[PDB]
Structures are given as structure tokens and as C-alpha cells.
Amino acid sequence: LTTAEYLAYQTERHVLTILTDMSSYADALREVSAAREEVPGRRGYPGYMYTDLSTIYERAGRVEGRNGSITQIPILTMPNDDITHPIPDLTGYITEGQIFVDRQLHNKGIYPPINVLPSLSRLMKSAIGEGMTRKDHGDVSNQLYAKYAIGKDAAAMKAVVGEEALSIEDKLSLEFLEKFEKTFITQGAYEDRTVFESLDQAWSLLRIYPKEMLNRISPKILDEFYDR
């Protein structure tokens, strides 16, 4: 963090930092304060981890005068796949949004095995826009999220109420769910895509539905891009 901060705020370089683990950091931290005689806290962890974790994380963000910047992507590891554990709780408390990694998707060979339903990024609204990117990002994001959420439950109901009783919407969503999983998220280990290419592929997937039905998308964007 110190070297990254030096670079960013004394050479004006947009820098990105990664850590790749913090659970092992928590272990190393519990080890200390046992050399000292501080009694263990919750789950055996030291109570005061909040302060030092804040110190680690909160050396980020842009600055007023200098043109530099900084970004962090800490990687955690929940012990038994529970969010109730103190480490993920504190990390969510300090940080903005989270990115999940489902076990089931990984079992089905999906790479990167990411599930989007629990994912979230609170500063999206300041990220997308015009110039900074195309104008249709924020709408396609919501549309795809809603349709994926619908498709999951549609697949759930398929087994209990057959397939014919499902509405036309249900069948289209069922097909779209599988297509999305197998093509969009599934990315090769060495396949690099620009944002524009990803947007185009998302448009291709959206083209499954009839133009009218994509309610959440504004009419302007629908008219502009739905063609072809």
C-alpha cells in the first residue's frame, strides 16, 4: 500500500492494487496479541481488528489536487461459506459492494464461476455514462439482472408444473437463462473483451425477447440499438 500510494500521489499514475487474501492476514493477526496477553475476542479474533483493517483499506480513493488515483480489490475467503463470519462482515462494512463466487456454478464448469444475484457495486451510477462509456450500459445492466432473476425461478417451477403451463414469458426466460450462462459469463482463461464487445453480446442475448416486452429499457435506447 505504501509503495502504491507513493506512485499514485507523487507521480500521478492511475494505479490498481490487489491483495489476493485476507483470511491468512486475520490468522497472522490473531497470532499477535497472543504473544501479548490480550484475551481473545469474538470467535477468538482480536476485538480491535476493525481499526487496523480500516487502516489497511481506507488508504484509497481519488484526491483533490493530484491527478493520480488508486483502487483496491481485496480477496477474502469465508471459512465455511457463511457471511455471518466477522471478517466478511467487517469487510462489507468498510467497503462498497461485493463480488461473489458460487460453488455450484464452478461445479458445472462455469468459468469464471460468478453468480450475479448477490453481487453489487454501489458506485456504478458514477462509473457509466456518456464519453466515459456508451449510453446504454445502465439499462442493459438492470434488464439482464431482472431477466436472470426471473429465469432462475422459472427453471425452478418447470419441474413442478411441467413446461406447457408456463407462460410464453416463462419459456423465453428459461431459454435465455441457459444461453446467458453458457455464453455470456463463460469466458476463456485468455479471452479478453472490451466493454463494447460485451455490450454487443448482451444486446444479442436480449434480442431473444420481443422488442415491446423489454419494459425496463427506455424507448429511446430500444429504438436506437435494437435493430439488426
Partner: protein
Amino acid sequence: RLNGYLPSTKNKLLTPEMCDEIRTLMPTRIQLYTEWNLLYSLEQHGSSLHSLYSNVAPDSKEFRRVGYVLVIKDRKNGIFGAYSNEAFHPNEHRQYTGNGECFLWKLDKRFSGYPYTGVNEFAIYCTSEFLSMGAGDGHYGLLCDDGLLHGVSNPCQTYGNEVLSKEGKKFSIVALEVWRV
């Protein structure tokens, strides 16, 4: 000596001059009653082959003498298609379901055609993964993907047709319409 349509406020449809021109070549007793029906489209019915097959229900009881017309526009506005007398629907691999009277064509503002020949009866086929017209040595005369994105067209003995697509060997789809008569 006239034809009608039944679309619903979408960007692209078929032209009346085109249908008048195509009306020339098809079995008699079909050209007589002329009220075309838009059974399926790519714009206002999604872009799913399963949706296409579901929309085109083989409802022949009212009229088993009904012509089925498929019109497809290629990447560069090269319009073409084929005429079929039987509804499309996936079947067992036993046989091609098709009467030896279908034909292909390359339309434009320059009509052409390739009537069925008695050399064989190939690739009048219909399955959940593709829907192709006459074939033989070399790939099929016509082909549309499960996803309705790319297609293939080549000469075949079943029709002796030329290459229809502007991009001959393979191409991409931009708009599709289906008509029932």
C-alpha cells in the same frame, strides 16, 4: 389478382410487389385464394427457433392444401427463400417429410427460381437444431442456425439451385419472416 397482409406496427415487413411476383410459381388452386397471413416474424416474436416452431403449429385440418413461404434477408439485403407445403416441426430421423413440388428463389426489385427435380429427395428436413432445404454432396441448399444467426447455401441435386446468399458459403441473418397460404 391481389394479395393482403396482416402485420402489426413493426419496422420491416414484406412488400406487395414481391408477393405478386412470387405468386407466379406455385401449385394451382393456391394462387386463386390470395390472403397471406404472417404466421411468424423475427421482430415481434423474438429471435428463438423454438419460438418459431411453437408459433407455426401444423394446423392443417382447416386446409391441408396450404402453402408455407419462408423469406429471409441476408447480411447485405440479398432477399431469398423457399416455398414449402408442409409445416416445419422436429421429427424422427426416419424420412424427410416433403412433397416433391417445393422450390427455392432469389428475389429482388429480378425474380428467379429452382423447381424441385426428380433426381432425389434430400434435406427437406426439420429438427430442433436446424432447418435446411435440399442437399446432397456438399452442404445443404439452405440452412438456418438453432440461434438464427448464421446460414449456409450451396448447389444441390434436389434443386440444382445456384448460391442464393450474397455471402455464398456462409452468412448471417438480419431479419426473417414467414407466410402461410
